Each structure stands twice: as structure tokens, then as C-alpha cells.
Design an enzyme around this catalytic site. Structure first.
Site, mmCIF file in Angstrom:
data_model
loop_
_atom_site.group_PDB
_atom_site.id
_atom_site.type_symbol
_atom_site.label_atom_id
_atom_site.label_comp_id
_atom_site.label_asym_id
_atom_site.label_seq_id
_atom_site.Cartn_x
_atom_site.Cartn_y
_atom_site.Cartn_z
ATOM 1 N N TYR A 1 -4.699 74.033 -22.032
ATOM 2 C CA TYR A 1 -5.213 74.286 -20.683
ATOM 3 C C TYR A 1 -6.623 73.701 -20.544
ATOM 4 O O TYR A 1 -7.452 73.877 -21.427
ATOM 5 C CB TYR A 1 -5.185 75.818 -20.392
ATOM 6 C CG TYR A 1 -6.128 76.320 -19.289
ATOM 7 C CD1 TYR A 1 -6.108 75.768 -18.004
ATOM 8 C CD2 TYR A 1 -7.009 77.381 -19.538
ATOM 9 C CE1 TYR A 1 -6.935 76.257 -16.990
ATOM 10 C CE2 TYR A 1 -7.842 77.881 -18.539
ATOM 11 C CZ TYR A 1 -7.797 77.314 -17.262
ATOM 12 O OH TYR A 1 -8.597 77.826 -16.277
ATOM 13 N N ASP B 1 -2.553 54.187 -18.106
ATOM 14 C CA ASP B 1 -2.512 54.907 -16.833
ATOM 15 C C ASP B 1 -3.719 55.815 -16.753
ATOM 16 O O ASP B 1 -3.636 56.956 -16.322
ATOM 17 C CB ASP B 1 -1.221 55.726 -16.725
ATOM 18 C CG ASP B 1 -0.998 56.301 -15.327
ATOM 19 O OD1 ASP B 1 -1.363 55.647 -14.317
ATOM 20 O OD2 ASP B 1 -0.431 57.412 -15.230
HETATM 21 N N1 ADP Z 1 -3.510 70.816 -19.137
HETATM 22 C C1 ADP Z 1 -3.879 70.884 -17.835
HETATM 23 N N2 ADP Z 1 -4.855 71.742 -17.407
HETATM 24 C C2 ADP Z 1 -5.212 71.795 -16.084
HETATM 25 N N3 ADP Z 1 -4.662 71.040 -15.102
HETATM 26 C C3 ADP Z 1 -3.687 70.162 -15.451
HETATM 27 C C4 ADP Z 1 -3.226 70.025 -16.847
HETATM 28 N N4 ADP Z 1 -2.268 69.097 -16.890
HETATM 29 C C5 ADP Z 1 -2.119 68.672 -15.633
HETATM 30 N N5 ADP Z 1 -2.953 69.295 -14.754
HETATM 31 C C6 ADP Z 1 -3.042 69.066 -13.278
HETATM 32 O O1 ADP Z 1 -1.711 68.630 -12.909
HETATM 33 C C7 ADP Z 1 -1.790 67.294 -12.339
HETATM 34 C C8 ADP Z 1 -0.587 66.446 -12.737
HETATM 35 O O2 ADP Z 1 -0.373 66.528 -14.147
HETATM 36 P P1 ADP Z 1 0.183 65.269 -14.959
HETATM 37 O O3 ADP Z 1 0.313 65.745 -16.361
HETATM 38 O O4 ADP Z 1 -0.744 64.102 -14.732
HETATM 39 O O5 ADP Z 1 1.615 64.956 -14.307
HETATM 40 P P2 ADP Z 1 2.291 63.583 -13.820
HETATM 41 O O6 ADP Z 1 2.806 62.931 -15.084
HETATM 42 O O7 ADP Z 1 3.377 63.899 -12.848
HETATM 43 O O8 ADP Z 1 1.218 62.750 -13.137
HETATM 44 C C9 ADP Z 1 -3.103 66.742 -12.866
HETATM 45 O O9 ADP Z 1 -3.575 65.661 -12.093
HETATM 46 C C10 ADP Z 1 -3.982 67.970 -12.857
HETATM 47 O O10 ADP Z 1 -4.436 68.202 -11.498
#
Ligand code: ADP
Ligand code: MG
Ligand code: MG
Length: 271
Positions: A89, A133
């Protein structure tokens, strides 16, 4: 592994963010009370889009990487309709969100993020792992406000070709990438330059109103600096945004760049 998790093992909380094929939620493991993030993906959507393999690369690459500036992936599980990735997190959210809030960062914050970023990428590249990316929406912040690279769905080992259709903005992608040409670790170096410019200016250097024009800008490497960008920042940025991949600096050159060492609060470490 050695822990087959299931949904009933977690208390789901508030939506942390929105992904392409599902959202990410805050969650707490019922037994240890460990707080973490659950990335949720809808199978129907993954398969329909034909990106089931990117999800696989993401899990395999990220679960195996260990670095303070790289978001950990603890494991996964799935049910009838969904896959769930158990992630570390990140309390301070995304750099995307910090940029919308502050409009633009000062040289210390920018240089410090560039250092953490370069360190993280130095560790990936030593395994020939290309992220490809690197965007502010995929750059997260830990409890101390330290940058963490996440979302390895596009990562791959270098050298590589591009077999997958691009989807979003081209803003952070280098020429060899938007043209489907062969590429390597230098791709991440171009992205670093784009980020450095956007952190300082408030918007990416090749931003344009259409995909077609942004593509032109990137191919011709057409960018200019607002008056307020200092000589040091201009130098580092111009070194990174080179059309020819081989002309781009090595992460060590970035980490020891005078402007970076002069403004970064944190120490470099590609050592
Ligand atoms: N470990 C995390 N802690 C807090 N927010 C997160 C975390 N992982 C993802 N997010 C939030 O979720 C969004 C999308 O997650 P992501 O893993 O980039 O998915 P995708 O592969 O669909 O782009 C991020 O841009 C962020 O806002
Ligand atoms: Mg993402
Ligand atoms: Mg992804």
C-alpha cells in the site's frame, strides 16, 4: 508463495485508484491486520482486450523485484470473474495527483524524484528489465514521501520489439517505441526526461491536442523551455530527450549530473 489467499481473508476499504480493467482498493488482512492494496481485474475485460499476458508479466516481474523505490507485489488469487493482485500500500498516493495539486514542483522535489526514479530503474536495468510505461499515474509515494515505481504490465526484458497495441497517451513514450521499432533500456531514459520536464513545467514537453500531432512532436523531438527553467535543468533534459537512443546518458550520468546532485536531497545508488 506458500499462502493461497482468498477474498474472505480481507476487509476491503476505500477505492485507492482507477485502473484500465478494474479498480485498486485499500484492504486489511483479517488475521495480521496488515494493511495493503488490492488491485482488481475483470477477467472478461482482460481476455476481450487480449492483454492476459501483460498481467502475467506484471505478476512475475514485480513479485521478484526487491527495491525501496519499486512497489512490492505480494501475491495474487482470483475467483469466478476476477483476479486480485496483492500490493504494497502506498499512503501518499500518486505523483500524478501531487502534480495536479501543486501544479508544478520545485527543483529540490523534482531532482529528488529523479534520483529515486533513476535508482529504481538502475536496479531494473541490471536485470535487463525495461519498464516502458513510466507515467506519473504509475509513480506512487510511500509513508516518507519516497517515490515507488508501480504497474509493470508493460515491462519486458531487453532488447525487445513491440507486439502490443498502444492504448493511452504517447506523452512519455520515445520515438522507437511509438514506431514499433526495436528498443532497450534507453526507453526508460527518455521517459525520465519527459518526467523531469513535466515536474518542473506542469505539463509534458510534447503535449498536443491530438494523438496525431503529439506523435509528430515526439518524432521531431519538438519541445521548448518556459523562461523559468534553469540552465541545469535544461541541460539534463536536453541530454535525455535525444532521438537516437544511444545518445541518451546512462543512469549513472543522470545520478551524478551537477544539477541533480545540487538539488537532490537523497543520495544516488546505482553503485
Ligand atoms: N499500491 C497502491 N497504493 C495506492 N494506490 C494505488 C496502488 N496501486 C495502484 N494505485 C492507484 O490505482 C491506480 C491504477 O493502478 P495500476 O496498478 O496503475 O493499474 P492499471 O494497470 O490498470 O493502470 C493508480 O494510478 C493509483 O491511483
Ligand atoms: Mg497504471
Ligand atoms: Mg498496467
Amino acid at each position: 508463495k506458500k499462502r493461497q489467499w482468498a477474498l474472505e481473508d480481507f476487509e476491503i476499504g476505500r477505492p485507492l485508484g482507477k485502473g484500465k480493467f478494474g479498480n485498486v482498493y485499500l484492504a486489511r488482512e483479517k488475521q495480521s491486520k496488515f494493511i495493503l492494496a488490492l488491485k482488481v481485474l475483470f477477467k472478461a475485460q482482460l481476455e476481450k482486450a487480449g492483454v492476459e499476458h501483460q498481467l502475467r508479466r506484471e505478476v512475475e516481474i514485480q513479485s521478484h523485484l526487491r527495491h525501496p523505490n519499486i512497489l512490492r507485489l505480494y501475491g495474487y488469487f482470483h475467483d469466478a470473474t476476477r483476479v486480485y493482485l496483492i500490493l504494497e500500500y502506498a499512503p501518499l498516493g500518486t505523483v500524478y495527483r501531487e502534480l495536479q495539486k501543486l501544479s508544478k514542483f520545485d527543483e529540490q522535489r523534482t531532482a529528488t524524484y529523479i534520483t529515486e526514479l533513476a535508482n529504481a530503474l538502475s536496479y531494473c536495468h541490471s536485470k535487463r528489465v525495461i519498464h516502458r510505461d513510466i507515467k506519473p499515474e504509475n509513480l506512487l509515494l510511500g509513508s516518507a514521501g519516497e517515490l515507488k515505481i508501480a504497474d509493470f504490465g508493460w515491462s519486458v526484458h531487453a532488447p525487445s520489439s513491440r507486439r502490443d497495441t498502444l492504448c493511452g497517451t504517447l506523452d512519455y513514450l520515445p520515438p522507437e517505441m511509438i514506431e514499433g521499432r526495436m528498443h532497450d533500456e534507453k526507453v526508460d531514459l527518455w521517459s525520465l526526461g519527459v518526467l523531469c520536464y513535466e515536474f518542473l513545467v506542469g505539463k509534458p514537453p510534447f503535449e498536443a491536442n491530438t494523438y496525431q500531432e503529439t506523435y509528430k512532436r515526439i518524432s521531431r523531438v519538438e519541445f521548448t523551455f518556459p523562461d523559468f527553467v534553469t540552465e541545469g535543468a535544461r541541460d539534463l533534459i536536453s541530454r535525455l530527450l535525444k532521438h537516437n537512443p544511444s545518445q541518451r546518458p546512462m543512469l549513472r550520468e543522470v545520478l551524478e549530473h551537477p544539477w541533480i546532485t545540487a538539488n537532490s536531497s537523497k543520495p544516488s545508488n546505482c553503485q
